[PDB]
Scaffold this motif. Structure first.
Motif, PDB file in Angstrom:
ATOM      1  N   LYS A  22     -18.371 -13.427   0.188  1.00  0.00           N
ATOM      2  CA  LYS A  22     -18.738 -13.676  -1.456  1.00  0.00           C
ATOM      3  C   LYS A  22     -20.931 -14.225  -0.411  1.00  0.00           C
ATOM      4  O   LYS A  22     -21.581 -14.281  -1.000  1.00  0.00           O
ATOM      5  CB  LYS A  22     -18.971 -14.173  -2.152  1.00  0.00           C
ATOM      6  CG  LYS A  22     -17.429 -14.791  -2.833  1.00  0.00           C
ATOM      7  CD  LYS A  22     -17.014 -15.312  -3.578  1.00  0.00           C
ATOM      8  CE  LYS A  22     -16.243 -16.387  -2.704  1.00  0.00           C
ATOM      9  NZ  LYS A  22     -16.716 -16.606  -1.194  1.00  0.00           N
ATOM     10  N   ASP A  44     -15.802 -15.734  10.029  1.00  0.00           N
ATOM     11  CA  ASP A  44     -14.307 -15.237   9.576  1.00  0.00           C
ATOM     12  C   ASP A  44     -15.481 -14.025   8.776  1.00  0.00           C
ATOM     13  O   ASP A  44     -15.928 -14.578   7.741  1.00  0.00           O
ATOM     14  CB  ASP A  44     -13.835 -16.133   8.707  1.00  0.00           C
ATOM     15  CG  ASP A  44     -13.138 -14.895   8.500  1.00  0.00           C
ATOM     16  OD1 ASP A  44     -11.295 -14.407   8.727  1.00  0.00           O
ATOM     17  OD2 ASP A  44     -12.868 -14.930   6.857  1.00  0.00           O
ATOM     18  N   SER A 160      -2.426 -12.044   7.360  1.00  0.00           N
ATOM     19  CA  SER A 160      -3.055 -12.351   6.789  1.00  0.00           C
ATOM     20  C   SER A 160      -2.163 -12.624   5.485  1.00  0.00           C
ATOM     21  O   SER A 160      -2.292 -11.262   5.058  1.00  0.00           O
ATOM     22  CB  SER A 160      -4.419 -12.365   5.777  1.00  0.00           C
ATOM     23  OG  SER A 160      -6.106 -13.028   5.247  1.00  0.00           O
ATOM     24  N   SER A 211     -10.348 -20.514   1.645  1.00  0.00           N
ATOM     25  CA  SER A 211     -10.517 -21.123   0.241  1.00  0.00           C
ATOM     26  C   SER A 211     -10.834 -22.805   0.598  1.00  0.00           C
ATOM     27  O   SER A 211      -9.517 -23.345  -0.537  1.00  0.00           O
ATOM     28  CB  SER A 211     -10.402 -20.522  -0.646  1.00  0.00           C
ATOM     29  OG  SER A 211     -10.703 -18.744  -0.829  1.00  0.00           O
ATOM     30  N   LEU A 213     -11.422 -25.331  -0.558  1.00  0.00           N
ATOM     31  CA  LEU A 213     -13.089 -25.717  -0.730  1.00  0.00           C
ATOM     32  C   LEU A 213     -12.632 -25.865  -2.077  1.00  0.00           C
ATOM     33  O   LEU A 213     -13.094 -26.028  -3.395  1.00  0.00           O
ATOM     34  CB  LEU A 213     -14.441 -25.921  -0.273  1.00  0.00           C
ATOM     35  CG  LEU A 213     -14.737 -26.091   0.701  1.00  0.00           C
ATOM     36  CD1 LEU A 213     -16.897 -26.079   1.451  1.00  0.00           C
ATOM     37  CD2 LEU A 213     -15.104 -27.505   1.367  1.00  0.00           C
ATOM     38  N   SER A 215     -12.938 -22.371  -2.701  1.00  0.00           N
ATOM     39  CA  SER A 215     -13.337 -21.176  -3.677  1.00  0.00           C
ATOM     40  C   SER A 215     -14.299 -20.795  -4.714  1.00  0.00           C
ATOM     41  O   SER A 215     -14.076 -20.622  -6.016  1.00  0.00           O
ATOM     42  CB  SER A 215     -12.812 -19.749  -3.729  1.00  0.00           C
ATOM     43  OG  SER A 215     -13.777 -18.828  -3.583  1.00  0.00           O
ATOM     44  N   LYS A 263     -16.991 -21.491   4.176  1.00  0.00           N
ATOM     45  CA  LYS A 263     -17.836 -20.312   3.713  1.00  0.00           C
ATOM     46  C   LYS A 263     -19.354 -21.355   2.978  1.00  0.00           C
ATOM     47  O   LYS A 263     -19.364 -21.922   2.124  1.00  0.00           O
ATOM     48  CB  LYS A 263     -17.649 -19.640   2.693  1.00  0.00           C
ATOM     49  CG  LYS A 263     -18.767 -18.529   2.681  1.00  0.00           C
ATOM     50  CD  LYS A 263     -19.760 -19.346   0.914  1.00  0.00           C
ATOM     51  CE  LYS A 263     -20.242 -18.097  -0.072  1.00  0.00           C
ATOM     52  NZ  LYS A 263     -21.038 -18.771  -0.812  1.00  0.00           N
ATOM     53  N   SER A 264     -20.154 -21.027   3.128  1.00  0.00           N
ATOM     54  CA  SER A 264     -21.673 -21.131   2.975  1.00  0.00           C
ATOM     55  C   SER A 264     -22.680 -20.622   3.518  1.00  0.00           C
ATOM     56  O   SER A 264     -22.933 -20.091   4.205  1.00  0.00           O
ATOM     57  CB  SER A 264     -21.655 -22.722   2.558  1.00  0.00           C
ATOM     58  OG  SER A 264     -23.163 -23.317   2.187  1.00  0.00           O
ATOM     59  N   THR A 266     -26.064 -22.075   2.289  1.00  0.00           N
ATOM     60  CA  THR A 266     -26.672 -22.630   2.311  1.00  0.00           C
ATOM     61  C   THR A 266     -27.132 -23.780   3.426  1.00  0.00           C
ATOM     62  O   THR A 266     -26.143 -24.430   3.979  1.00  0.00           O
ATOM     63  CB  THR A 266     -26.235 -24.100   0.581  1.00  0.00           C
ATOM     64  OG1 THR A 266     -25.849 -23.183  -0.176  1.00  0.00           O
ATOM     65  CG2 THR A 266     -27.421 -24.727   0.481  1.00  0.00           C
ATOM     66  N   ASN A 273     -20.720 -29.533   6.628  1.00  0.00           N
ATOM     67  CA  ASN A 273     -19.398 -28.736   7.252  1.00  0.00           C
ATOM     68  C   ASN A 273     -19.309 -29.083   8.585  1.00  0.00           C
ATOM     69  O   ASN A 273     -17.871 -28.519   8.524  1.00  0.00           O
ATOM     70  CB  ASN A 273     -19.091 -27.403   6.549  1.00  0.00           C
ATOM     71  CG  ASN A 273     -19.254 -26.806   4.671  1.00  0.00           C
ATOM     72  OD1 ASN A 273     -19.901 -28.423   4.133  1.00  0.00           O
ATOM     73  ND2 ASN A 273     -19.623 -26.020   4.610  1.00  0.00           N
TER      74      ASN A 273
HETATM   75  N1  LIG Z   1      -7.657 -13.592   4.131  1.00  0.00           N
HETATM   76  C1  LIG Z   1      -8.220 -13.325   2.921  1.00  0.00           C
HETATM   77  O1  LIG Z   1      -7.621 -12.679   2.068  1.00  0.00           O
HETATM   78  C2  LIG Z   1      -8.837 -13.999   2.370  1.00  0.00           C
HETATM   79  C3  LIG Z   1     -10.014 -15.134   3.541  1.00  0.00           C
HETATM   80  N2  LIG Z   1     -10.778 -15.578   3.182  1.00  0.00           N
HETATM   81  C4  LIG Z   1     -12.317 -16.206   3.802  1.00  0.00           C
HETATM   82  O2  LIG Z   1     -12.243 -17.523   3.615  1.00  0.00           O
HETATM   83  C5  LIG Z   1     -13.250 -18.393   3.473  1.00  0.00           C
HETATM   84  C6  LIG Z   1     -13.054 -19.699   2.885  1.00  0.00           C
HETATM   85  O3  LIG Z   1     -13.145 -19.223   1.694  1.00  0.00           O
HETATM   86  P1  LIG Z   1     -14.261 -18.741   0.426  1.00  0.00           P
HETATM   87  O4  LIG Z   1     -13.418 -18.428  -1.268  1.00  0.00           O
HETATM   88  O5  LIG Z   1     -15.223 -17.949   0.686  1.00  0.00           O
HETATM   89  O6  LIG Z   1     -14.123 -20.420  -0.305  1.00  0.00           O
HETATM   90  P2  LIG Z   1     -14.593 -21.729   0.328  1.00  0.00           P
HETATM   91  O7  LIG Z   1     -13.408 -22.757  -0.351  1.00  0.00           O
HETATM   92  O8  LIG Z   1     -14.876 -21.810   1.419  1.00  0.00           O
HETATM   93  O9  LIG Z   1     -15.995 -22.056  -0.598  1.00  0.00           O
HETATM   94  C7  LIG Z   1     -16.712 -21.579  -0.606  1.00  0.00           C
HETATM   95  C8  LIG Z   1     -17.750 -22.118  -1.911  1.00  0.00           C
HETATM   96  O10 LIG Z   1     -18.057 -24.226  -1.321  1.00  0.00           O
HETATM   97  C9  LIG Z   1     -19.745 -24.063  -1.441  1.00  0.00           C
HETATM   98  N3  LIG Z   1     -19.867 -24.940  -0.823  1.00  0.00           N
HETATM   99  C10 LIG Z   1     -19.743 -24.673   0.884  1.00  0.00           C
HETATM  100  N4  LIG Z   1     -19.871 -26.057   1.307  1.00  0.00           N
HETATM  101  C11 LIG Z   1     -20.057 -26.612   0.397  1.00  0.00           C
HETATM  102  C12 LIG Z   1     -20.368 -28.140   0.499  1.00  0.00           C
HETATM  103  N5  LIG Z   1     -20.921 -28.569   1.785  1.00  0.00           N
HETATM  104  N6  LIG Z   1     -20.446 -28.502  -0.758  1.00  0.00           N
HETATM  105  C13 LIG Z   1     -20.639 -27.881  -1.220  1.00  0.00           C
HETATM  106  N7  LIG Z   1     -20.264 -26.554  -1.873  1.00  0.00           N
HETATM  107  C14 LIG Z   1     -20.128 -26.370  -0.784  1.00  0.00           C
HETATM  108  C15 LIG Z   1     -20.221 -22.467  -1.353  1.00  0.00           C
HETATM  109  O11 LIG Z   1     -21.538 -22.422  -1.742  1.00  0.00           O
HETATM  110  P3  LIG Z   1     -23.137 -21.883  -1.145  1.00  0.00           P
HETATM  111  O12 LIG Z   1     -22.084 -21.284  -0.492  1.00  0.00           O
HETATM  112  O13 LIG Z   1     -24.082 -21.819  -2.300  1.00  0.00           O
HETATM  113  O14 LIG Z   1     -23.203 -23.349  -0.315  1.00  0.00           O
HETATM  114  C16 LIG Z   1     -19.586 -21.669  -2.073  1.00  0.00           C
HETATM  115  O15 LIG Z   1     -19.922 -21.696  -3.335  1.00  0.00           O
HETATM  116  C17 LIG Z   1     -14.194 -16.490   3.248  1.00  0.00           C
HETATM  117  O16 LIG Z   1     -15.503 -16.379   2.843  1.00  0.00           O
HETATM  118  C18 LIG Z   1     -13.770 -15.766   3.677  1.00  0.00           C
HETATM  119  O17 LIG Z   1     -14.265 -15.636   5.028  1.00  0.00           O
HETATM  120  C19 LIG Z   1     -11.111 -16.457   1.975  1.00  0.00           C
HETATM  121  C20 LIG Z   1     -10.326 -15.650   0.796  1.00  0.00           C
HETATM  122  C21 LIG Z   1      -9.397 -14.959   0.916  1.00  0.00           C
END
Ligand SMILES: NC(=O)C1=CN([C@@H]2O[C@H](COP(=O)(O)OP(=O)(O)OC[C@H]3O[C@@H](n4cnc5c(N)ncnc54)[C@H](OP(=O)(O)O)[C@@H]3O)[C@@H](O)[C@H]2O)C=CC1
Ligand SMILES: O=C(O)COc1cc(F)ccc1C(=S)NCc1ccc(Br)cc1F
Ligand SMILES: [Cl-]
Length: 316
Positions: A22, A44, A160, A211, A213, A215, A263-264, A266, A273
């Motif tokens: 995303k 990742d 995965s 995920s 946090l 997601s 993921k971020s 920001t 993080n």
């Molecule tokens: N193997 C698989 O099938 C999968 C793999 N993944 C992997 O895992 C990664 C992480 O999981 P994902 O589902 O993206 O979600 P996360 O649980 O990592 O959450 C990401 C969200 O949290 C926000 N965020 C990040 N840091 C903070 C913070 N310190 N305070 C507040 N909000 C925060 C981000 O906002 P912002 O970016 O706007 O800062 C974004 O909206 C994925 O990006 C991918 O690389 C995920 C799902 C499936």
């Protein structure tokens, strides 16, 4: 805590990485540049995320800048479901390598156990909305992954979203050459995954928590869904430690011997993080966080649920 975990291929993997699902293509280059500048050494990635070229621009610039050396980075990508074919695996890996500006991956994962019909569409559907499967199973796909190690394209291979019995099938594969190094699965306080984690860890596979946090930016989020980052029980633990809720959510898997990939895009949050190496959650904190399990998943998909290899009908 120590920053890396030893894998069953003999390589060390950073326990904190940057997620990129995303991350918009016009933001992810800067995100990865910032991440590397502030200490991240693990990214990742996945072809299906559609942003590997832009991730690669950042990696390549930081290598060119000599901010880091290639050996110090740990770059992960994943084989998408439409490339579970003996004749398509190498090319899928090579496209990812070309996009990421790399000559090898540190880790390449089978993204999901389910193979889909090859073609341009990432989710080929029949006229009733069911995903169209591939007849190619997880064992033949695994053999194709093993070949990538033996060709020097990847240093480690893994899986995965494999359930317990799918991990077991891999481990029981006739003629297995390389065990999976990693199983990357969803894991957080509302989906604590104790059973699958214990199984994998008992077999020497390292688990990566995705995920972590919850997601919040998932495209299918509904208002009434539970929210880790807003859960006052977790906020209270964070306040006690003078950390953010996100920092607690990241430290939690670390203390379970997991790798974690928040993921971020920001910059401030990317830095926040990473600042998770100078506090410890108590055993009571850990057990308290585990107690929040509700078997809630971010990542599930109705269109794929009849696929014979869809992973989440099993208990674990
Ligand atoms: N193997 C698989 O099938 C999968 C793999 N993944 C992997 O895992 C990664 C992480 O999981 P994902 O589902 O993206 O979600 P996360 O649980 O990592 O959450 C990401 C969200 O949290 C926000 N965020 C990040 N840091 C903070 C913070 N310190 N305070 C507040 N909000 C925060 C981000 O906002 P912002 O970016 O706007 O800062 C974004 O909206 C994925 O990006 C991918 O690389 C995920 C799902 C499936
Ligand atoms: O998958 C990702 O990493 C993150 O999420 C995705 C990322 C993408 F770039 C495109 C789709 C997804 C979806 S919809 N993923 C869920 C999903 C896909 C396939 C199967 Br089998 C089950 C399932 F639950
Ligand atoms: Cl992918």
């Amino acid at each position: 805590m120590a920053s890396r975990i030893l894998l069953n291929n003999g390589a060390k993997m950073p326990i904190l990485g940057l997620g990129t699902w995303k991350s918009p293509p016009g933001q992810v280059t800067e995100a990865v540049k910032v991440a590397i500048d502030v200490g991240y050494r693990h990214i990742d990635c996945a072809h299906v995320y559609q942003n590997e070229n832009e991730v690669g621009v950042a990696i390549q610039e930081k290598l060119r800048e000599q901010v880091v050396k290639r050996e110090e980075l740990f770059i992960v990508s994943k084989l998408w479901c439409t490339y579970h074919e003996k004749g398509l695996v190498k090319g899928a890996c090579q496209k990812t390598l070309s996009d990421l500006k790399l000559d090898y991956l540190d880790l390449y994962l089978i993204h999901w156990p389910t193979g889909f019909k090859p073609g341009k569409e990432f989710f080929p559907l029949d006229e009733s909305g069911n995903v169209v499967p591939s007849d190619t199973n997880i064992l033949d796909t695994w053999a194709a992954m093993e070949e990538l190690v033996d060709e020097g394209l990847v240093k480690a291979i893994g899986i995965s979203n494999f359930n317990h019995l799918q991990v077991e099938m891999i481990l029981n594969k006739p003629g297995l050459k390389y065990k999976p190094a990693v199983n990357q699965i969803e894991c957080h306080p509302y989906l604590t995954q104790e059973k699958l984690i214990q199984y994998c860890q008992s077999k020497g596979i390292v688990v990566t928590a995705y995920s972590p946090l919850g997601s919040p930016d998932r495209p299918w989020a509904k208002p009434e869904d539970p929210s880790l980052l807003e859960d006052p029980r977790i906020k209270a633990i964070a306040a006690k430690h003078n950390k953010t809720t996100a920092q607690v959510l990241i430290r939690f898997p670390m203390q379970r011997n997991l790798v974690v990939i928040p993921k971020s895009v920001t910059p401030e949050r990317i830095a926040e993080n990473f600042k998770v190496f100078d506090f410890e959650l108590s055993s009571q904190d850990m057990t308290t966080l585990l107690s929040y399990n509700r078997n809630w998943r971010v990542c599930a998909l109705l269109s794929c649920t009849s696929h014979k290899d869809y992973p989440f009908h099993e208990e674990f």
